[PDB]
Amino acid sequence: DEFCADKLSNYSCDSDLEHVDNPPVLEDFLGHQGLNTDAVINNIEDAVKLFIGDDFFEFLVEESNRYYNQNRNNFKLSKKSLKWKDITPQEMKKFLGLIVLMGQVRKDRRDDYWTTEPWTETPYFGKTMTRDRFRQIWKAWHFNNNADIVNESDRLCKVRPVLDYFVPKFINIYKPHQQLSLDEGIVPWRGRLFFRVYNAGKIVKYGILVRLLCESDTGYICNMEIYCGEGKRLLETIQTVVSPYTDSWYHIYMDNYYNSVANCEALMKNKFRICGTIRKNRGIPKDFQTISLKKGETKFIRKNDILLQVWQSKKPVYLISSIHSAEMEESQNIDRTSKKKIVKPNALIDYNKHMKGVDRADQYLSYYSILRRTVKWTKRLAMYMINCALFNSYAVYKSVRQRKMGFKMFLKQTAIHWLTDDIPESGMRAKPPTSDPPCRLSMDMRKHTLQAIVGSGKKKNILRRCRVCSVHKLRSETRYMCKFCNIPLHKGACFEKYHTLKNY
Amino acid sequence: PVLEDFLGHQGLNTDAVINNIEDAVKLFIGDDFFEFLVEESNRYYNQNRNNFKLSKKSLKWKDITPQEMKKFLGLIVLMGQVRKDRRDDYWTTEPWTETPYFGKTMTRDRFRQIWKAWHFNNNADIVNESDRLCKVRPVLDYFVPKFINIYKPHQQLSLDEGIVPWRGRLFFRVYNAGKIVKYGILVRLLCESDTGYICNMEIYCGELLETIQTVVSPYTDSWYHIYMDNYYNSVANCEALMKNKFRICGTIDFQTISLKKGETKFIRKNDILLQVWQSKKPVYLISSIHSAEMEESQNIDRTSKKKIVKPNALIDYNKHMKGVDRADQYLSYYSILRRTVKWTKRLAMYMINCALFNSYAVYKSVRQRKMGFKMFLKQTAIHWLTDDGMRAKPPTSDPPCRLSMDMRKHTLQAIVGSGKKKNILRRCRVCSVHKLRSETRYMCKFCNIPLHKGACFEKYHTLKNY
DNA sequence: CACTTGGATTGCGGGAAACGAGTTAAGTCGGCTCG
DNA sequence: CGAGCCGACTTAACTCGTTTCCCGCAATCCAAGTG
Ligand SMILES: [Zn+2]
Ligand SMILES: [Zn+2]
Ligand SMILES: [Zn+2]
Ligand SMILES: [Zn+2]
């Protein structure tokens, strides 16, 4: 349904590609920054504006008009109208707002929202933009220069400038809690880029590698990086991720598959503490590689302040930590045969608590279901990024002013706001008839108002012949005259026609 | 070596005039179904008339008549075309997510009063509830016999369980590790392997060969081939099933412990092949439908060779076992869904979807045209909502489009009354926000808001606050 | 023994849609006038 | 030498009371995701 011009969008891709004890750390520093914001919010609209706003729209509008012109030759297929260069920021808000709004009423195709079919009608869309205008903008929705990069068949730089817009805001609006975590999220949308072979764990993901750093209690996104490289940059996994957060003693909980003991020193150099799983083909002392435990038994070894522990489950469970002592404690778990509960290393219990109630932004991706089937690669990625920005706006809103809402309502209200244009810009002849004024076709409801006619004779409730009716040689009287220009007019259509039409 | 060919018949067993949607559906669902639902719904409500605390301003109860029940289902089915997340938000008056059609079909409270009464059994009259399913029993009874006598399946059949998801109080909470639903009602059913047509049913209910033989019962004495998964067959079952003239193929003599990769050995006894192949695990194959052979086939998956050599039995097994999912996978997520507390409603809804599915399969058998199930369902809802003096809604919030200054769109039209008189006035929206009752018969044609001439109309479009 | 959330499920009530009784505001048309 | 103002007559917008339901919130109790 769409065409590509640069041989990168939707190219070079295919289908179907889917020392025998352990002290706790005592040198636990809390010398960090406040868990707060750098901005003023009174309501939902103010919160949204910190991440998404008019400058976002200017960017989208400028690029959209440029793209269409460059490729205008295959629009020969035609359109009802061609003001395609005339997209302005106010139209683009409507374009985006309608897409977000669609998640509240979910239909199967984009083309079924703009319908006239009375059975499943949703009239608001029809009253906001026309069907063809939306499609024309859709084809023209584009995110980049399209003529600056000629040196390589990159297929990344195409969405790069969108990400560049949002990243500094995730960093400068809000700062996170002592505990952070890493993951790899993303939408199940049939994208076209496959690097599955380099994963270090996963959430169903499309297109490119995506790295998230999130606050452990709230789900706020602290950083994001995409397509870090094809496995070449996934080791030293967090070095490009937590860079702006160094020296803050954040504790990082992770489950990446490429951690190591050696890696832990790097984290200490940058003042981070970690907890996560460890692979066996790693710098694990050999004497701990050949062990046997009874179910529920643990073994602990340490070197320096790094604890390597094994708890025995169906699988031995390995955990590496630079935070906890090797102590056992009752967990909340109950065995099917025992109400006495199961005792586990405190580190494991703590680890699991901080890996949940996180990455809430990804949890809501199912909302934008319309973006799955027939979408160009770059549109899907840009939408992920917009959703992330809305999520962060919500989290801040809620954290600054405690109220109960939910992300779902935050989004509905935001869409209504964007879609609303609430910004304002004496003789025998009782009266000599006149010619039609030059202001006749000035379209303004603030000026062409209706008032009753007041006479000069004994009877003030005077009626006069309508000018429009005079044109057709009809005699019909009215009590009303246009106030702007003194022409007697009937109420209803004659007043509308006189001020609206070139003739009458 | 199957030497008896096939003694069945295929396709419609009835005079189904398949030239439209309506005549495909009525075979399974129709007016007598609704007569059943109405009779029980009116008895249920009145028999339990006390303890309702009906409020003062709601509508008074009126008994349910057949059209309302047809509307009732039609609206529920449409909710699958347009999805909203709360049952009562379909009646919202907010202009941006409005779906006005529902509002014009029946009111919110009427829908809630019918919903409550959508009952399936006269438990008040018959109290001999020894049967945990006695409350859905007549629903199950209504639909299954039709599946059997409308259409006959071709030679290859398969057996599996249907799924009705449910985390609340139920007959059982047993989960079979080889099944796809963690919890809910499991249904035992046969279907035709190519179309998914559902042929016969039983409900996992109450608490091997006794049920295998029972479900297949209407299909004995004709040489049907039945394909089975890990938990339905046995060697002994095969022997028994042969006595009723049908053949079995499926999965489930220690020598098989010996190992070989690539081509492997079989044990063959008494015309039953008991071959064991090896993949990640020993692959057991039992068959009374073909001779032993091993040959290549084109895999869907990428493989080391263009084609991979496998026991012929696996080649056929993995082509016929699709019938089970196409038979109802749609029905697990399309409408007639709830998070209700009545298990009876969830189960009854599953049964309704089976009937709609079978209607679709029949339709396609006759016509060469290809359309999905989804369109069959949408059109059905349209038909049921078609008719084989409602009050105007009050305003609740002022539309976001009122400030758009286009004098071609905003115009005064006279109100047209839905009641006895066409002329009827309404409260002026510009005056009632100051609690001044005053009445008018002119309205903005684009916005649907009542206004007075001039002084009110101008303010409503021009002023941010009025 | 859950954690968390929000959709069913339960009602209560501010307000106005509808109909008819009973007084007002704007229209039809004439036959005389000033352009 | 062209088309209207005062007056006497008809319809069409407005109060007011009164019954009857509209959907919008607001309060409890579990069923979905996965310790
Ligand atoms: Zn004017
Ligand atoms: Zn006129
Ligand atoms: Zn209007
Ligand atoms: Zn008014």
Author numbering:
A (entry chain D): 10 to 27, 73 to 479, 494 to 572
B (entry chain C): 78 to 284, 288 to 332, 341 to 476, 495 to 572
The authors write:
The cryo-electron microscopy structure of the piggyBat transposase pre-synaptic complex showed an unexpected mode of DNA binding and recognition using C-terminal domains that are topologically different from those of the piggyBac transposase.
To further define the interaction between pBat and its LE, we assembled complexes of pBat bound to LE44 and solved the three-dimensional structure at 3.6 Å using single particle cryo-EM. In the structure, both monomers of the dimer contribute to the binding of a single LE44 duplex. pBat possesses a large core domain consisting of the RNaseH-like catalytic subdomain that contains the DDD active site (D237, D309, D413) and a predominantly β-stranded insertion subdomain; these, in turn, are inserted into an all α-helical subdomain. The pBat CRD has a small, central three-stranded antiparallel β-sheet and binds two Zn2+ ions in a cross-brace mode, one using Cys3His1 ligands and the other with a Cys2His2 coordination sphere. The two CRDs of the dimer together bind the imperfect palindrome (P1LE). The interactions between the pBat CRDs and the imperfect palindrome result in a ~ 60° bend in the DNA as it curls around the dimer formed by the CRDs. The core domain is largely responsible for the recognition of the GCGGGA motif and all six bases are recognized by amino acid side chains (G11 by R189; G-12 by R185; C-13 by D186; G14 by K134; and C-15 and T-16 by R497 of the CRD). The paths of the pB and pBat bound donor DNA superimpose well, but the relative shift of the orange core domain means that the tip of the pBat transposon end is also about 13 Å away from the nearest DDD catalytic site and 35 Å distant from the other active site of the dimer, a clearly catalytically-incompetent configuration. The configuration seen in the current pre-synaptic complex, if extended by flanking DNA, would prevent DNA cleavage, ensuring that pBat will not generate a double-strand break before synapse formation.
